[PDB]
Design a protein around this ligand. Sequence first.
Ligand SMILES: Cc1cc2nc3c(=O)[nH]c(=O)nc-3n(C[C@H](O)[C@H](O)[C@H](O)COP(=O)(O)OP(=O)(O)OC[C@H]3O[C@@H](n4cnc5c(N)ncnc54)[C@H](O)[C@@H]3O)c2cc1C
Ligand SMILES: Cc1cc2nc3c(=O)[nH]c(=O)nc-3n(C[C@H](O)[C@H](O)[C@H](O)COP(=O)(O)OP(=O)(O)OC[C@H]3O[C@@H](n4cnc5c(N)ncnc54)[C@H](O)[C@@H]3O)c2cc1C
Ligand SMILES: COc1ccc(NC(=O)CN)cc1
Lengths: 587, 586
Amino acid sequence: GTSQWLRKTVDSAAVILFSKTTCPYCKKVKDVLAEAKIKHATIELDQLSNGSAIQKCLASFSKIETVPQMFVRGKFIGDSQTVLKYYSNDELAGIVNESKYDYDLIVIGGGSGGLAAGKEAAKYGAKTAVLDYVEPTPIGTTWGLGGTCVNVGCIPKKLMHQAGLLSHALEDAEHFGWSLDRSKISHNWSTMVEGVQSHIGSLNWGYKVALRDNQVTYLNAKGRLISPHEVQITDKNQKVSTITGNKIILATGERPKYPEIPGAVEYGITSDDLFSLPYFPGKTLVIGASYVALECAGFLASLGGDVTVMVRSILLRGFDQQMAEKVGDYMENHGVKFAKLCVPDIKQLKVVDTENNKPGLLLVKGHYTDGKKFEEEFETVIFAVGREPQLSKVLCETVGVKLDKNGRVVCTDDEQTTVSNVYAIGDINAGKPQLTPVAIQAGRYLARRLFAGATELTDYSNVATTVFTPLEYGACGLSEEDAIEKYGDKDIEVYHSNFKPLEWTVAHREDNVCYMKLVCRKSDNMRVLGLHVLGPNAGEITQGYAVAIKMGATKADFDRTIGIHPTCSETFTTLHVTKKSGVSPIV
Amino acid sequence: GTSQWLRKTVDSAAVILFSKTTCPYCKKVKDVLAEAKIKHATIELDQLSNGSAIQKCLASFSKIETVPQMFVRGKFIGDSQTVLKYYSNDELAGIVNESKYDYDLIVIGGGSGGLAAGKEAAKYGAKTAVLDYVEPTPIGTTWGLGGTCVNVGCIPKKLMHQAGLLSHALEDAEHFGWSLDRSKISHNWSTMVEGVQSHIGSLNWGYKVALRDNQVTYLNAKGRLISPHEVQITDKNQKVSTITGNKIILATGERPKYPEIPGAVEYGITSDDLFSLPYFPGKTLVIGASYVALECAGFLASLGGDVTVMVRSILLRGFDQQMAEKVGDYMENHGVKFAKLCVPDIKQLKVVDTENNKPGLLLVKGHYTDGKKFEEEFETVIFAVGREPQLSKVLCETVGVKLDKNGRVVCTDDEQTTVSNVYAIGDINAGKPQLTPVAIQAGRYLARRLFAGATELTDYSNVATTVFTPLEYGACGLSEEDAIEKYGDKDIEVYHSNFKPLEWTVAHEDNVCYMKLVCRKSDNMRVLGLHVLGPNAGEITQGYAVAIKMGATKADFDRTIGIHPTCSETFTTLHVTKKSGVSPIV
Ligand SMILES: Cc1cc2nc3c(=O)[nH]c(=O)nc-3n(C[C@H](O)[C@H](O)[C@H](O)COP(=O)(O)OP(=O)(O)OC[C@H]3O[C@@H](n4cnc5c(N)ncnc54)[C@H](O)[C@@H]3O)c2cc1C
Ligand SMILES: Cc1cc2nc3c(=O)[nH]c(=O)nc-3n(C[C@H](O)[C@H](O)[C@H](O)COP(=O)(O)OP(=O)(O)OC[C@H]3O[C@@H](n4cnc5c(N)ncnc54)[C@H](O)[C@@H]3O)c2cc1C
Ligand SMILES: COc1ccc(NC(=O)CN)cc1
């Protein structure tokens, strides 16, 4: 048991010190490393349960039973007296820095998971390189370090959500007594794009400063893993070279798909382009029905766009479909137009006016599911039909990393690939939820297991979401259909209720459009299987309940907790209408 | 053991059926009972783990062992066949209205807790009356059915907070691309009050309609308990009479205090007057430092008022004091002036202009704790120096209801007072968190124990709160100083971090929002307190109150993933300790 663990820890760690909080001979050696500015992991043996057993099992490497013991890259360096002799004789710097490869860790991908892994590893003395490179979009769009969320995903889209929400705040302000007249106020797209971009620029810079102050090498280069320990890099002059690393982490993420139809790549755009577009999109057609499509369609309408969404079959495939539909009914009622059961077949009538900063004009041809024909003009056309990786760019097939039928890396539950020194994290890890906090947790936790002796794994179950559509949708756990299909209709009870935010009363907003429900399993103490809420601030509402769900909350737990008044969330502490009872859920 | 539960359930219930979901004789009786529109409790014996043992105990009352068994106010009515006989003979309607008293229940007090008990009790057949009367304030302000929260508390003051917040939403809009100019925009107090008052009116009406539809008697009169079962009522014409009830629930709430200084009652107002005021307060002095004081001073400043708060000693006594100071710093940095360590010793310079709709003018004199003198002019002086009950106005001293030193009712953990048919709920129940959702839960759960045999008690531990100051403050559990006092500094670890909402980056402060977790080293690092200052602090906090209730630890917070981008997600990655001395800024 403990012998399997200590073997792999000592082999994997770069510099690791087995210590005791009390022993002043360990304090002496801690301070010497600190003075020499040598980073390392520590393992305080007095603070562990099998702590005493490890000390005796440590003698198998060192032939001593005592603390401290210093290892460097799988090799015993010495006790307190031996480490101090190396220090006095100016030999210690040479011992720690000498390695089989160039780096202990090479990270391919400077995104959410990738930067998180890098900094964490560097805290234990691992010598780390982070590679990042942004291949331009078909029209040339490029951005800086930090990944997809930072430059063209969560961060820019939510700020554009917020500009869109602020419009209803000016609508509301009159009813609450302010003297503005929302009718005579307009929106400037380029002004907003400049503020979003000025903030994205502060995060690019902050990531470079962070990497530098952890002594991480940052190479803006395209990386390719040609052998288990060899990464070939092509820099921005196309200078090719090769570096070696002990552990390898792949964190290269995904990029948007285009449909295989004429005009799409030539005349359309994706989210990658939307967030630094120099001109207002104008009359827009969004093709797709994922959360990217609905979210992007949502803020454009709220900034005064004439928006249409073309839907192949359903909205938010893979989400609870009752909720998905309520999200879409709200959009259709508040300015978004839907062309349902419809696909595209894209002609250019005007070129983008790059000097004057005006969109072009395009003609979209398609057909509906029955047979009827679609044809309409649009100034901008956005595709949101899913994302994919292209590991063939990243990974030579001769290395022997196994991929699945979607193009994603098959890992074990500790992120290990089929090559024992190669791991994958984030969106390219097959089967895992594709969310930025998941990538960050995975990368951080793997760094500790590789260099600090940690054994904790990332829990991928019951991770909560939020779709930032004009009315938001938070969730944690199973959809209603998924629970029913898994356990049987007669074993599921559902508690639901409409509600109305108190901030909507004076504003004369809708009475029975916000909604929530608890999906529960009767034969398991009425355990909460999923939580769902459509309303404002849905992410702040949902997040706290994810801890309780993680802990196995029951309906009785929600019941005996007392609500905070007046809030939207408190409606969860008093649910009581069931679906089976037939009673209406309206306020 | 089980026998003492049944004897107490059959004695208080008004109409109760003992049943089995399986039995078709039980179904037959059920069908008759609400064909006649007779409300009743039902106890399905095959869903209670000791339904066998209970059925045997029933015979001590009924001489029979089978189901269905129906009782009315403690007397056994009959089995299946006996009730059906009574039906076809037109006798059953008169059995169920047999009572020693006018009402199965009388609630004195028509607010958060009182309305909640009354509706729920009526659901199981209990003949119920709810009493509500609103004594005028010194200037004569009065309002309608629903209590303090609905009329002069949570509801109106949060609507006014929302009006304060929209001001910063207007400022933020320019930075996000909108064409307005915030400096050319002002606020209309009376437009706002009309909207708030319209909503409050629709709440008054909804509560009246709700009581009607549950067959509850609403008497707009002032009640006084003269004996355990006798309630003296005085109606709007000063007519006096007496009604009797079996059970009594006191739920009369509290009212604002005034300081005993000259001019306070004559020339000042309280929150009781603020939310229906015809004129904008104007330059305002706020006296006190409770959450009412700070909340009210907060939105007045955001609507363009010139606001000073006079603080006797500290802010928010009783809450975590690190958080109190941060709440006040933000207010001082965004408009609100503070006169600290200072009390008032009120002379009137202008009478309120009732025609043109304008405030008067006042002269406040006071002193700081060092002796130095205070003297300044204001248009409106608001007193927020606490609240209190006045039970010598509900409750003859001879009834035998014991009160504590502050005049609140001393109750067992099941809301029973010292007279065994009389109960107290809400703000007048000594020692209990004074909050509306606590009043509501206490009332509903007591109704179920009295008329439907339930046994669940109200759990008053770890109830979370939110202070709706211009930057909000949500909490659940122990403060940091309290945690340290109970367990000692060495057994307490505190994780904390600053943060900045994403909504704030484009609108241009970096390190004002703050959160911490107060944990216990020896109990697996249990979470003893959660604290967060920032926007939507109530939506943020609520969900965590469920996990705390279940006994959450630092490791439970760590294994849950965040939702990005949100403020709340910052709780799932805390790692800097106060011990470490490391800075919590970002
Ligand atoms: C429009 C949109 C909105 C989203 N909104 C949210 C949201 O609100 N919340 C949320 O949780 N998630 C959101 N996501 C998803 C989230 O952004 C991703 O799950 C997250 O970015 C994945 O992290 P990652 O590190 O695996 O990949 P990435 O962040 O994409 O990092 C990969 C990086 O590596 C680079 N790279 C690729 N190949 C190579 C190579 N060969 N050599 C060197 N560098 C290379 C890429 O250029 C890129 O910068 C959104 C995604 C999109 C598209
Ligand atoms: C300014 C302010 C803001 C507040 N904000 C919040 C908040 O945001 N959240 C929160 O949870 N709590 C808040 N509170 C507290 C909340 O108002 C109380 O906790 C709650 O109203 C208590 O309910 P209750 O049923 O005990 O009493 P009440 O709701 O006050 O009802 C008691 C009723 O009894 C009536 N009455 C009194 N004597 C008699 C008599 N002799 N005969 C008949 N009727 C009588 C009174 O007129 C009153 O209507 C606030 C309080 C104030 C003052
Ligand atoms: C008695 O109910 C009220 C009705 C109206 C108001 N005031 C206004 O509408 C404008 N000051 C206040 C209380």
